[PDB]
Amino acid sequence: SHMALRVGIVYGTRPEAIKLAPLVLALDADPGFEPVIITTGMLDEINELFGLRPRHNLDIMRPGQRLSAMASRIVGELGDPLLDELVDVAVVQGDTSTAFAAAYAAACERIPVAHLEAGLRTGDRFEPFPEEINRRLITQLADLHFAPTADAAGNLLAEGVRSDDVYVTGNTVIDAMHLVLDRPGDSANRELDAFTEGRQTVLLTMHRRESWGIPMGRVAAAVAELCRSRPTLRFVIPLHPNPEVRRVFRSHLSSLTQVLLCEPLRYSEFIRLMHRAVLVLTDSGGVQEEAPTLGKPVLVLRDRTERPEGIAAGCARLVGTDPALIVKEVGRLLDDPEAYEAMRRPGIVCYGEGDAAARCLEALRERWLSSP
Amino acid sequence: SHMALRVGIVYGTRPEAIKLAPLVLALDADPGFEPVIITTGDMLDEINELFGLRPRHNLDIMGQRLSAMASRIVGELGDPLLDELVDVAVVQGDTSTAFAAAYAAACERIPVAHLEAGLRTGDRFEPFPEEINRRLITQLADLHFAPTADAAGNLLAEGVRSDDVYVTGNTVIDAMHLVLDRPGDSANRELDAFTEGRQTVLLTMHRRESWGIPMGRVAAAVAELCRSRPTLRFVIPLHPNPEVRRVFRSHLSSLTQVLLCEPLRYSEFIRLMHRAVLVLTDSGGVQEEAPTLGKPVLVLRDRTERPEGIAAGCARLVGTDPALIVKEVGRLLDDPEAYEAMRVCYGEGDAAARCLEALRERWLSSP
Amino acid sequence: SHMALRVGIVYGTRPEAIKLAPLVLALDADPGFEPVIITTGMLDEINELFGLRPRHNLDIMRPGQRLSAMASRIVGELGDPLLDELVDVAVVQGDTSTAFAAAYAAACERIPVAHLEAGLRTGDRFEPFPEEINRRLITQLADLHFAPTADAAGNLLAEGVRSDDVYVTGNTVIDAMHLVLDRELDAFTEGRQTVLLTMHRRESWGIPMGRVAAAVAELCRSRPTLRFVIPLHPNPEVRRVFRSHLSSLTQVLLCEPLRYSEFIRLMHRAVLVLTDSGGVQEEAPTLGKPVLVLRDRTERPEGIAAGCARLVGTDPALIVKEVGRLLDDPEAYEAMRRPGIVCYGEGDAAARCLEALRERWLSSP
Amino acid sequence: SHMALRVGIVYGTRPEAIKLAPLVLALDADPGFEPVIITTLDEINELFGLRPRHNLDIMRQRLSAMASRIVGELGDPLLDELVDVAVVQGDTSTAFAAAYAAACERIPVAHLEAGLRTGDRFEPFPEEINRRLITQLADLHFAPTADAAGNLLAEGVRSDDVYVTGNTVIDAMHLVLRELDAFTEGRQTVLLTMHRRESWGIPMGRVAAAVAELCRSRPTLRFVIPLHPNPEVRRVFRSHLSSLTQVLLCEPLRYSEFIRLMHRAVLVLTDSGGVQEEAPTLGKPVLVLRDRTERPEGIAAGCARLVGTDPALIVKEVGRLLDDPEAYEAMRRVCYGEGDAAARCLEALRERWLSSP
Ligand SMILES: O=c1ccn([C@@H]2O[C@H](COP(=O)(O)OP(=O)(O)O[C@H]3O[C@H](CO)[C@@H](O)[C@H](O)[C@H]3O)[C@@H](O)[C@H]2O)c(=O)[nH]1
Ligand SMILES: O=c1ccn([C@@H]2O[C@H](COP(=O)(O)OP(=O)(O)O[C@H]3O[C@H](CO)[C@@H](O)[C@H](O)[C@H]3O)[C@@H](O)[C@H]2O)c(=O)[nH]1
Ligand SMILES: O=c1ccn([C@@H]2O[C@H](COP(=O)(O)OP(=O)(O)O[C@H]3O[C@H](CO)[C@@H](O)[C@H](O)[C@H]3O)[C@@H](O)[C@H]2O)c(=O)[nH]1
Ligand SMILES: O=c1ccn([C@@H]2O[C@H](COP(=O)(O)OP(=O)(O)O[C@H]3O[C@H](CO)[C@@H](O)[C@H](O)[C@H]3O)[C@@H](O)[C@H]2O)c(=O)[nH]1
Ligand code: NA
Ligand code: NA
Ligand code: NA
Fold this sequence. Notes:
The structure is cut from a larger assembly and holds four copies of chain A.
Chain A: E1 5-11, H1 14-29, E2 33-39, H2 43-50, E3 56-57, H3 67-77, H4 79-84, E4 89-93, H5 97-108, E5 113-116, H6 131-141, E6 144-147, H7 150-157, E7 166-168, H8 172-181, H9 184-187, H10 190-196, E8 201-205, H11 214-229, E9 234-238, H12 243-253, E10 259-262, H13 267-276, E11 279-282, H14 285-293, E12 298-300, H15 308-312, E13 316-318, H16 323-335, H17 337-342, H18 356-368
Helix pairs in contact in A: 1-2, 1-8, 1-18, 3-5, 5-6, 11-12, 11-16
PDB class: isomerase
Keywords: Epimerase, UDP-sugars, isomerase
Entry title: The crystal structure of Non-hydrolyzing UDPGlcNAc 2-epimerase in complex with UDP-glucose
């Protein structure tokens, strides 16, 4: 019956749910707090795995919808459930239009906002759009910023954020990984094991809209070429749920016995697969954080990254969508064990130790459960 | 957890559901595919229950203007196709659902396959809109499952590339075989009690162009045959339209020799057709099913999309002329040589497997 | 008071309005017919110039709208004005989603359809989308087809159209040009070799248009006497690519869309034309202007075969080379204007459409 | 017929219209540009000859509902009018929601009067956060002062995206330069405007009491108080001052009449941002009826002093200026530009969006 700080948790996508799940679990377990989940948007599957129970699902998001229409709906309609649920403080995560529109909706009701995973920057204006501008808008709206790294905290100060409002918590994705590594029952997959057992397996994920069509086609051609040249090499490619992404990989690779094209994997099964892989090709932000933590070299299928820490430490290299460079760089790592080891620093942490949820909780308690 | 080709299956009517059911079952059993059913149209629940079809979405779109119905399907089918992550969409036959759904799929750059492609009368806008629907679907579809060589030829004459056409045969033969293999579910006490010990004619008639006077002439032909042949019985399952029910009821409800029926479950309907001495119909599907059971067919139309049965002597056009119907039924009952002259046109019952292999070749292959 | 065949005319874009205008004028002048215009969608300006008076404007089309939503609205809502205006027959033009959705809406009311400019094909499935599929859908819906060329008539027969339903009328765009042939631009072009350039196709937005703009910049640097006039398609992304590449070049006049009369006068003064426009590929050869086509495919193969036009795509080196050849070698220039062939008709297409309509729908056996 | 850069101009209030008017006129006169106005006052539009292409009838109402409507509905007119670039002004929820709506359509945004800060988070709300959001959305920033340009750099804006243009309010004043005349003619007249929501009720009551006290103590002193059109603001001034013959309570004045009155006034008491810029330009000392200002330049130069809503301090500070000619002259003498801000904005627009490398 003692007062709980009621913490609004707003998300619409898989990566947000994964990164918020450890914070929701920590808020639930701590008697000083009550998490209140509102979704805007695969998601049921992540909710089931971590035991997240949304109080409200706004049925706002969908493929083939204008950004302005979606943002209009969130700004217009999120206020009522935030007020109805007596939210004291609202947490948003990452770079989504949900995170931006929900932070604004909360600000309109004078509900203080905290930003989970604050301060990631490429330094390329409106690239990608709208994610890069969303981060800069959330940064001005948020009272409190949970930065995953010292570098991200530095980016926040450069945008005029006061040092007292920035906490380097590390990234909750490390917490999330550790939670599913501790769940063998849920992690198991007969077909994936049978396909990877005794082979060098490359794990590949690619989803970014700016790479749709021709650039993804070049990456698929690089996969085909590596498979032809290296009969013992395998690829597992879990496909982003977009029909255009599925079509490009399917039309380039569906006949190659060396490639297992997959449906999206449950997070537990995906982390187990990543642990078994020899290396990871991705344009995913989260996989750039997860893979180095499992000691897997990462080749980044982009011309820019918001994870410069892995680049500077040699854990990750930019490869873009150049098929000759991808073939070369994957070859180097498979053929030269010294090049392979130079990309593994598996006793060094870029993105936190897996206690980020507890560091977020203590920041919330210091800011909103304290008096001078 | 391996990637499945997600195949949208869109239908609104009984004949579509019957012809798609064997393809749904084959897609379900094959690990390379996942069927996703979206309905637009309690006849259908009954077919879904019998074949174990489980719709993911029912749109509740289908006495309504064609333009309003087509507008709603074009407008609203895209969202469930995108939400269900459909890779490819299959439509069947000649319905406004098949056309509007093919168009809605094309708008989302979802490739379309047409089940039972290339049937033509050669009579423009007859019937309307079914004849034009086929020609529109033909231009929208990437892949065409033709039941016969003749149907494949009709597709090439409309500029379809030979590589996009597969002669699969008709899945209605697959569907028939599935319910012939289920005697327990095919049983019907009341039908057996009515037909036991008598020669039974099976009659179905539903086409809008025959409503009112033409159906009345067919009902008069039934009445005349019944008066002249006291031992003859008819079973007439009625299409669920009040005007069709009223014409048959007002002409035949007092004749002890006629059993007017509610629509029959497909299993029971095929068992009845197997027991019948001959079949009178304007149904496309029954023109395919009846010859496969060795039953002579008299076709209650001035045209057919099944010319193969006509050319092979399995079927004869009789239109809605009561004198000709009485004569032609009489000939078959009285002259065993005429009967035997009217006993594969439409495939071997492996059409679902041939569709699956065409889908795998087109959309589960890389160069 | 004698019965007129009431002919529905449905369009939503400038190119449709230009190509339908001569048919509307011929229908208006002939006592056997009454044109009834319904718009779905610059257009006021074309309506004013040719004296077109729409009976109904549906206000369906939009810059940022899903194809399915637009097609749904036309299928759903065009029937009411067609019935209210007692339309007997409907004419649609070209390859637009309006032409397809309106033909379908007309078919739903059992209103017969005629297709103006029928049978143009690349042979590249769904390229562009949805225009290539729209033509093939309209082709199945239309009772009557006005083909601009014998080649286009051949494409219709290969899709199962009966020969009696196909008339080679020629293209009404030639009629339209002739109607308009009977000040800042003048000052800019007067003493100078002027290239006219239009480019609008969605498949070329961004990088390909950037390459074309770079080709223009290179030609301007190498040839100080050369001028370009570039009327810009009204799309902000198209305007941005040309503006960001060319706005400082004194030799380039970037323009707002020109009124059709002013555009045809400019084309007559130009030394040559670079375009991805269908209509400009038909208009330019008729004024004896060599055309370089900024696409990898064309629906006007007649101009290619007759040497009037050449495909140049969006390859900047090839564009620089091909424009250079025509400016520098008067024999190469004359080879693209050789007399002796008329590709797209003589400018009597409206009258040939009218007589096909009278034969089909104002006759009894 | 040559291509013009089509510049969207979006505003919903009098202060925005006044500050945008000189930019609209400069865009209209220059052949390289075409202004396209979308509104979210008729009298200000008439005075400067502004002709809106579209009026969205959105403003009245919850902040979230208004912002939702602008984000949701402004895109269509921006696309229909073929806008190439969009300009927003000041700190309004219109300026923020319109900048966002433009960004959603990949229309580049310029912010007129960029970089004003108090440094007090969410004070006032939502104006202080609106500026910081517009700052991240805008490609181009027209800062009125070097101080404002410095505030933009501290929020990570690149120096190349910031132009110190000065404030277009000076341009607007220059463009405009009977009962009021009869009331002010032979007399020392104080001009007072006060409208800020954070001062409604008790604080405005204290300011009205200060006016009453000054009037009682100084029979020769007059006040003109044009009242903000809010019934609560009108009620507080009316109930405190309507019987005082030395106070003329007014309806809002047309901009030309307001600037003429300010020229005749001996000094100005205001919580208006624009009046803090206009008054020093006419050599009128300003006492600012707030605890903070976004115009620190006038404070530092001695043109303006903060007085808040403390009646004793207001009485004292007005007394000092009326009684001591040395204190008066210390508050008179450019803080906010020379009146060529429109032309400097135009040249920044031409350099950024009407140039090729
Ligand atoms: O089959 C799969 C593939 C991936 N994952 C997980 O999904 C997440 C990645 O999701 P993805 O769709 O690739 O998004 P990201 O690119 O990782 O995330 C973007 O969006 C987030 C929310 O705004 C931001 O935090 C990130 O910085 C930004 O890059 C990771 O935790 C992966 O382990 C699965 O569980 N199953
Ligand atoms: O009591 C009954 C009567 C019929 N049937 C079955 O229903 C189907 C026929 O349905 P019907 O309404 O008569 O439609 P058809 O006329 O067969 O089908 C039309 O519509 C189909 C869908 O577009 C096309 O494939 C056909 O060519 C076209 O003729 C057949 O399989 C019959 O066996 C029953 O199950 N029970
Ligand atoms: O500033 C300009 C530019 C062009 N035009 C005229 O506009 C037409 C060209 O319009 P455009 O937008 O380029 O479209 P097109 O590419 O010509 O037309 C497409 O759309 C038409 C309608 O479906 C089809 O007939 C064509 O085959 C197809 O290529 C021609 O008459 C030009 O002379 C002007 O009047 N002013
Ligand atoms: O009776 C009157 C009173 C004032 N004014 C004029 O109105 C403007 C002031 O408007 P006001 O309602 O007081 O608004 P401000 O407080 O000046 O403006 C706020 O809103 C603007 C737009 O967001 C920002 O530029 C400012 O920094 C911010 O303080 C000035 O130009 C005055 O000259 C009149 O014309 N008549
Ligand atoms: Na708790
Ligand atoms: Na399956
Ligand atoms: Na006429």
